[PDB]
Amino acid sequence: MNTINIAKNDFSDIELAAIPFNTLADHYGERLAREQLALEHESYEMGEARFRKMFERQLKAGEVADNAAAKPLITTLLPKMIARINDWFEEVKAKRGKRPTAFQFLQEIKPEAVAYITIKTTLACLTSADNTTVQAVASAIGRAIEDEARFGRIRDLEAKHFKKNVEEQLNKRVGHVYKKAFMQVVEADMLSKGLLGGEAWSSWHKEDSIHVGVRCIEMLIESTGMVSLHRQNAGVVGQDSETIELAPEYAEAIATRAGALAGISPMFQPCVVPPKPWTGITGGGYWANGRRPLALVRTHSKKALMRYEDVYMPEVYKAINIAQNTAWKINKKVLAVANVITKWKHCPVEDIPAIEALTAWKRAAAAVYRKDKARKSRRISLEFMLEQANKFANHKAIWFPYNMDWRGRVYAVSMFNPQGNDMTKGLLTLAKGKPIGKEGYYWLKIHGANCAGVDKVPFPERIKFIEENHENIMACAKSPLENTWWAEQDSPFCFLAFCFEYAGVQHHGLSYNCSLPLAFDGSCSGIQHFSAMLRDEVGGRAVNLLPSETVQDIYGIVAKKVNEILQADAINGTDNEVVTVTDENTGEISEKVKLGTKALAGQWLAYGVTRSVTKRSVMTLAYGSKEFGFRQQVLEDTIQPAIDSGKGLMFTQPNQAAGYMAKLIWESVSVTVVAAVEAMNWLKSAAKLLAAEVKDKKTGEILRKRCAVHWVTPDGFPVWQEYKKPIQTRLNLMFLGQDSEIDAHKQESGIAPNFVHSQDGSHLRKTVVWAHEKYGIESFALIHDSFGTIPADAANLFKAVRETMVDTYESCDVLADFYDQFADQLHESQLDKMPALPAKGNLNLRDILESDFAFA
DNA sequence: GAATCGAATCGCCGC
RNA sequence: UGCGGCGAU
DNA sequence: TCGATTC
């Protein structure tokens, strides 16, 4: 009800603490320490204000139980509330005579659903409604019970298979009134089908719903002292009323928890001094001893964090500290452009002036609904980034703290970060620059082509395109408001950043000091690393690991391969056959035609398949997508947009075309990048064998317990995959749903993507130290796959990122090391089932050193 | 045994 | 946590 | 689609 302010005592400590300020003052002076400590104090100030506004909004709408302050109270209160209503059913069943009015209504709804509905709606009514009378909350409890009881039968019994297609539609709706209206509409559709047994819901009378809530309030009172009954003006027939008041101890508990969480959640901001070097697991980045300390590894469990303190990983610690030491400054020229065009447009780039029908309208209506949500959500991120950029514009340099996830990929801790979108990327440039030279001017021009989308074309033609458009680049840099050409580009704000630096080198020559980040980005990091482990030549050429005559587009290679299958199937494909299909819920037997491969090939060739049909399928391969996942993708990305546009008349039956295309893509990717498919299968089966508990069916006892997966990456970072699932969970249709065993499915679903993401993090970290020590590189722009530095350092970072990969996979076979970790953990019965290590190919790693288009 | 289900990480915003 | 949306890879 | 979990 009334939250304590953590700021008065706790937040003042981080500014006035004796030891953090001196350690900051000895490195960078006392006056920079005062500004930094006040900035970190403001970071905690803003985060507490964020929690308070959210809490007050949840107080108004009755969403207090959704807040994390009320969760520990409900978690202990719920087991006694569920038992009290279960016992009361047993007492009434033993009781003779008339059953109570509420007894019949309580049985149909789930009893655990009663316990949360009562607790949530009581606290919603006590906190917000301003009426403490028993009947108003009791009517609210009964109406909430009836709403779950009336529409729960759709989820529970008659449509438990039909719900899975309306569940996603229900989840897309936001707000209980919006969720209810669709639930009424779906009930009318289901009752027309006769699916619910043809029994329409009989609406509870208003007097009946109060009797439901009153008994539930009393049953909560016997279970817990959440509310105490009060009777006012008793004996007066006109003024007799009964009220319930929330427990002062329980309201104190939520406020104490709310004040604690308000100090735990800060809004992280860039550092005005270089960040504190990561000496250990905690305390790195920001200097002050605070309530929320930064962790080297972002772990969901504190036990997983504690595994990192014993291990000695010197190279991991250096690479983060070098990345933190990179100084950034806000590019003022792009900021001056961005400040004026953002006031005129929600997104400055979204519109530039240049030279089954009902279901189609329903999907069109859902398109303008999500776009309205999208355009609001996109803007509120932009306003925060612009304010952060405008705040630190005048500072000579800012620094970003760096930590990393449990896999090993590094991220910037601050909310404003170089790892953001195009505008945020363009608003940030490196602080320490060097004279550009001929090599840097060449690489600056190459970076200008990449921001323009000329990345698919080899290096000499990328240089030519910049020189052809030289007069347009100078005109855009001369006045970005007068010429909109830079906005039309793929990466507009970063392209405009290149235009300013391109114009400076024309005015000031090759002696110009350029501090612009020059990003080299690997084409497909997961497949590059997978092709490197198993030395697959055709995969490495597809991901530009090998030197090539031109930049090789893996989407185009697959699109060419599926095109070859399409033309062959158009001549020798299967003819169409009629197939019986039965809808199980209806029981209806119908005879539909099945399109053969010959007919399906003719449809797709009439559409014309390009890299765009195959593009998303290739990207999601490293995440674990296969033929089934591709079927949904080609439908939503190519077929469904076609039929809204008037195309797709060829796709007479869209799902058959999707399954046909998914098979063709999966056959093509499996033969294009062989190592990627085999390596992910080896990792998935290894995790599956380690996940599963081993028992003989006649002995019952488990010979081997469910085991987690652990491996160590080449630069010394250990990573533990322990996906764990809760035993029980609660779900309500109209209300928010409210040690532990290893979830085997998540262990298999995540082993291969996280392993290759651990490899790219080690590659990024090894690249940072190699470029820092073998070469003179001190400024780094790191976004997982992208490696960026100043133009004068751009040539060496180009060499360094290749040298680290060729050294890493020559030194270690990470898959073979992985097999050494879990082989002793494996049960002897699983040993015969375990696949052998995938065969090593013909690719030579030294060719990566001379590959122009790897970029990484 | 039949029944039935699934189909990467990190942040921000909202419910 | 989950759900919805956005972005990064 | 299919090898799973999952009852």
Could you give the angle at which helices A674-691 and A525-534 cross, rounded to 10 degrees? Answer: 90
Q: Residue A301 CA to nucleotide B7 C1', Å? A: 27
Q: Is the CB of A624 under 7 A from strand B?
A: yes
Task: DSSP for A624-639, please give it.
Answer: T--HHHHHHHHIIIII
Q: Which two tokens stand for residue A410?
A: 């590094």
Return the residue matching tokens 């964020």. Answer: A50
Task: DSSP for A559-576, please give it.
Answer: HHHHHHHHHHHHHHPPPP
A846 DSSP assignment:
G
User: Assign residue A551 a region: left if phi > 0, alpha if psi is -120 to 50, beta otherwise?
Assistant: beta
Question: Cα A131 vs. chain centroid, distance in angstroms?
Answer: 41
Residues of A21-50 as b/e, b for ≥16 C-beta within 10 angstroms? beebbeeeeeebbeebbebbbebbeebbee
Positions 709-738 of A with beta carbon below 7 A from strand C are 736-738
Strands A227-232 and A398-399: what pairing? unpaired
Distance CA(A654)–CA(A644), nearest Å, equals: 13
Distance CA(A689)–CA(A515), nearest Å, equals: 51
Q: What pairs with residue A782 in β-bridges?
A: A787
Residue A234 is which amino acid? Answer: A
Half-sphere exposure of A679 (CA within 13 A, CB side): 31
A589 DSSP assignment:
E
Distance CA(A852)–CA(A725), nearest Å, equals: 45
Q: Is the CB of A165 under 7 A from strand C?
A: no
Distance CA(A104)–CA(A722), nearest Å, equals: 45
Q: What are phi and psi of A628, to 5 degrees?
A: -65, -45
Is residue A765 within 8 Å of A799, Cβ to Cβ?
Answer: no
Q: Give me the count of residues in chain A.
A: 856
For residue A686, which of A670, A712, A709 has the smallest C-alpha distance?
A709
Protein residue closest via CA to C1' of D1? A628
Distance CA(A789)–CA(A462), nearest Å, equals: 19
For residue A103, which of A87, A113, A89, A86 has the smallest C-alpha distance?
A89
Positions 400-459 of A with beta carbon below 7 A from strand C are 419-422
For residue A551, which of A440, A459, A629 has the smallest C-alpha distance?
A459
Q: What are phi and psi of A453, to 5 degrees?
A: 85, 25
Is residue A759 within 8 Å of A712, Cβ to Cβ?
Answer: no
Q: Which nucleotide is nearest to A403 (CA to C1')?
A: B10
Q: Is the CB of A171 under 7 A from strand C?
A: yes
Q: Which nucleotides of B are covered by protein (CB under 7 A)?
A: 5-15
User: Assign residue A322 a region: left if phi > 0, alpha if psi is -120 to 50, beta otherwise?
Assistant: alpha
The residues of A annotated with a catalytic role in the active site are 521, 615, 785
Could you give the angle at which helices A794-811 and A437-451 cross, rounded to 10 degrees? Answer: 80
- A382: number of Cβ within 10 Å: 17
Is residue A5 within 8 Å of A259, Cβ to Cβ?
Answer: yes
Positions 79-108 of A with beta carbon below 7 A from strand D are none
Distance CA(A328)–CA(A418), nearest Å, equals: 9
Half-sphere exposure of A724 (CA within 13 A, CB side): 11
Q: Residue A627 CA to nucleotide D1 C1', Å? A: 9
Q: Is the CB of A592 under 7 A from strand C?
A: no
Element (H, E) at A297: strand A297-298
Distance CA(A289)–CA(A20), nearest Å, equals: 7
Q: Which nucleotides of D are covered by protein (CB under 7 A)?
A: 1, 4-6
Cα A22-A27-A30 angle, rounded to 5 deg: 50
Element (H, E) at A18: helix A18-28
Q: What is the Rg, in whole angstroms, of the alpha carbon atoms belonging to chain A?
A: 31
Q: Residue A11 CA to nucleotide B10 C1', Å? A: 28
Contacts 24+ apart (CB under 8 A), A122-126: A122/A217, A122/A220, A122/A226, A122/A227, A122/A244, A122/A246, A123/A62, A123/A64, A123/A65, A123/A70, A123/A246, A124/A62, A124/A63, A124/A64, A124/A65, A125/A62, A126/A227, A126/A244, A126/A245, A126/A246
Q: Residue A156 CA to nucleotide B2 C1', Å? A: 21
- A640: number of Cβ within 10 Å: 17
Distance CA(A460)–CA(A467), nearest Å, equals: 11
Distance CA(A805)–CA(A801), nearest Å, equals: 7
Residues of A424-434 as b/e, b for ≥16 C-beta within 10 angstroms? bbbbbbbbebb
For residue A686, which of A817, A806, A839, A541 has the smallest C-alpha distance?
A817
Q: Residue A168 CA to nucleotide C5 C1', Å? A: 14
Q: Is the CB of A625 under 7 A from strand B?
A: yes
A202 DSSP assignment:
P
Q: Which two tokens stand for residue A74?
A: 């409900």
Q: Is A695 helix (H, G, I), strand (E, B) or coil?
A: strand
Q: Which two tokens stand for residue A465?
A: 């395109």
Q: Residue A173 CA to nucleotide C8 C1', Å? A: 26
Q: Which nucleotide is nearest to A160 (CA to C1')?
A: B4
Question: Cα A91 vs. chain centroid, distance in angstroms?
Answer: 49
Is residue A679 within 8 Å of A534, Cβ to Cβ?
Answer: yes
Q: Which two tokens stand for residue A455?
A: 């990345």
Protein residue closest via CA to C1' of B11? A415
Q: What pairs with residue A402 in β-bridges?
A: A412
For residue A786, which of A767, A805, A807, A803 has the smallest C-alpha distance?
A767
Strands A694-695 and A702-704: what pairing? antiparallel
Q: Residue A379 CA to nucleotide D1 C1', Å? A: 42
Distance CA(A681)–CA(A748), nearest Å, equals: 10
Q: Is A774 helix (H, G, I), strand (E, B) or coil?
A: coil
For residue A52, which of A289, A270, A265, A293 has the smallest C-alpha distance?
A265
Q: Residue A538 CA to nucleotide C1 C1', Å? A: 43
Q: Which two tokens stand for residue A669?
A: 């990717």
Q: Is A769 helix (H, G, I), strand (E, B) or coil?
A: helix
Q: Which nucleotides of C are covered by protein (CB under 7 A)?
A: 1-9
Q: Taking the domain A6-263, which CATH number applies? A: 1.10.1320.10
Rounded to a whole number of angstroms, the distance between the first and last alpha carbons of chain A is: 55
- Residues whose CB falls within 8 Å of the CB of residue A368, separated by 6 or more in sequence, listed in order: none
For residue A723, which of A752, A740, A756, A747 has the smallest C-alpha distance?
A747
Half-sphere exposure of A629 (CA within 13 A, CB side): 13
For residue A767, which of A856, A640, A645 has the smallest C-alpha distance?
A856
Q: Residue A841 CA to nucleotide D2 C1', Å? A: 29
Q: Is the CB of A745 under 7 A from strand D?
A: yes
Helix, strand, coil share (%) of chain A residues, nearest 5: 60, 10, 35
Q: Which nucleotide is nearest to A379 (CA to C1')?
A: C6
Q: Which nucleotide is nearest to A300 (CA to C1')?
A: C1
Q: Which nucleotide is nearest to A164 (CA to C1')?
A: B5
Q: Is the CB of A269 under 7 A from strand C?
A: no
Q: Residue A548 CA to nucleotide B7 C1', Å? A: 35
β-sheet with A410-412: strand ranges across: A297-298, A402-405, A410-412
Q: What are phi and psi of A703, to 5 degrees?
A: -70, -35
User: Assign residue A194 a region: left if phi > 0, alpha if psi is -120 to 50, beta otherwise?
Assistant: left
For residue A321, which of A715, A793, A769 has the smallest C-alpha distance?
A769
Return the residue matching tokens 């499996």. Answer: A670
Is residue A721 within 8 Å of A750, Cβ to Cβ?
Answer: yes
Distance CA(A254)–CA(A250), nearest Å, equals: 7
Could you give the angle at which helices A654-672 and A611-619 cross, rounded to 10 degrees? Answer: 70
Is residue A626 within 8 Å of A577, Cβ to Cβ?
Answer: no
Three-class DSSP labels, A325-373: HCEEEECHHHHHHHHHHHHHCCCCCCCCCCCCHHHHHHHHHHHHHHHHH
Distance CA(A214)–CA(A212), nearest Å, equals: 6
Q: What are phi and psi of A419, to 5 degrees?
A: -90, 20
Return the residue matching tokens 């509310």. Answer: A227
Helices assigned H by DSSP within A553-619: 554-572, 597-607, 611-619
Distance CA(A656)–CA(A651), nearest Å, equals: 8
Is residue A645 within 8 Å of A657, Cβ to Cβ?
Answer: no
Q: Which nucleotide is nearest to A176 (CA to C1')?
A: B15
- A762: number of Cβ within 10 Å: 28
Q: Is the CB of A744 under 7 A from strand D?
A: yes
Strands A402-405 and A297-298: what pairing? parallel
Task: DSSP for A704-739, please give it.
Answer: E----EEEE-TTS-EEEE--B--S-----SSS----
Distance CA(A787)–CA(A765), nearest Å, equals: 11
Is residue A762 within 8 Å of A408, Cβ to Cβ?
Answer: yes
Positions 619-678 of A with beta carbon below 7 A from strand D are 627-628, 659
- Residues whose CB falls within 8 Å of the CB of residue A574, separated by 6 or more in sequence, listed in order: A596, A597, A598
Return the residue matching tokens 């859902």. Answer: A366
Contacts 24+ apart (CB under 8 A), A831-834: A833/A685, A833/A689, A834/A685, A834/A686, A834/A689
Q: Which two tokens stand for residue A464?
A: 């030519």
Is residue A776 within 8 Å of A794, Cβ to Cβ?
Answer: no
Three-class DSSP labels, A376-441: HHHHHHHHHHHHHHHHCCCCCCEECCEEEECCCCEEECCCCCCCCCHHHHHHEEECCCEECHHHHH
Q: Is the CB of A789 under 7 A from strand C?
A: no
For residue A755, which of A441, A543, A533 has the smallest C-alpha distance?
A533
Distance CA(A247)–CA(A243), nearest Å, equals: 13
Distance CA(A281)–CA(A464), nearest Å, equals: 49
Protein residue closest via CA to C1' of C7? A421
Q: Which nucleotide is nearest to A783 (CA to C1')?
A: C9
Q: Is the CB of A750 under 7 A from strand D?
A: no
Question: Cα A301 vs. chain centroid, distance in angstroms?
Answer: 19
Q: Is the CB of A749 under 7 A from strand C?
A: no
Q: Which nucleotide is nearest to A784 (CA to C1')?
A: C9
Q: Is the CB of A181 under 7 A from strand C?
A: no
CA dihedral sign of residues A417, A422, A425, A426? negative
Q: Residue A348 CA to nucleotide B13 C1', Å? A: 20
Q: Is the CB of A67 under 7 A from strand C?
A: no
Q: Residue A185 CA to nucleotide B5 C1', Å? A: 27
Q: Which two tokens stand for residue A86?
A: 């279960």
Question: Cα A360 vs. chain centroid, distance in angstroms?
Answer: 29
Is residue A674 within 8 Å of A538, Cβ to Cβ?
Answer: yes
Q: How was this structure determined?
A: X-ray
For residue A458, which of A840, A166, A854 has the smallest C-alpha distance?
A854
Is residue A42 within 8 Å of A269, Cβ to Cβ?
Answer: yes
- A336: number of Cβ within 10 Å: 12
Protein residue closest via CA to C1' of B4? A161
Q: Is A71 helix (H, G, I), strand (E, B) or coil?
A: helix
Q: What pairs with residue A783 in β-bridges?
A: A786
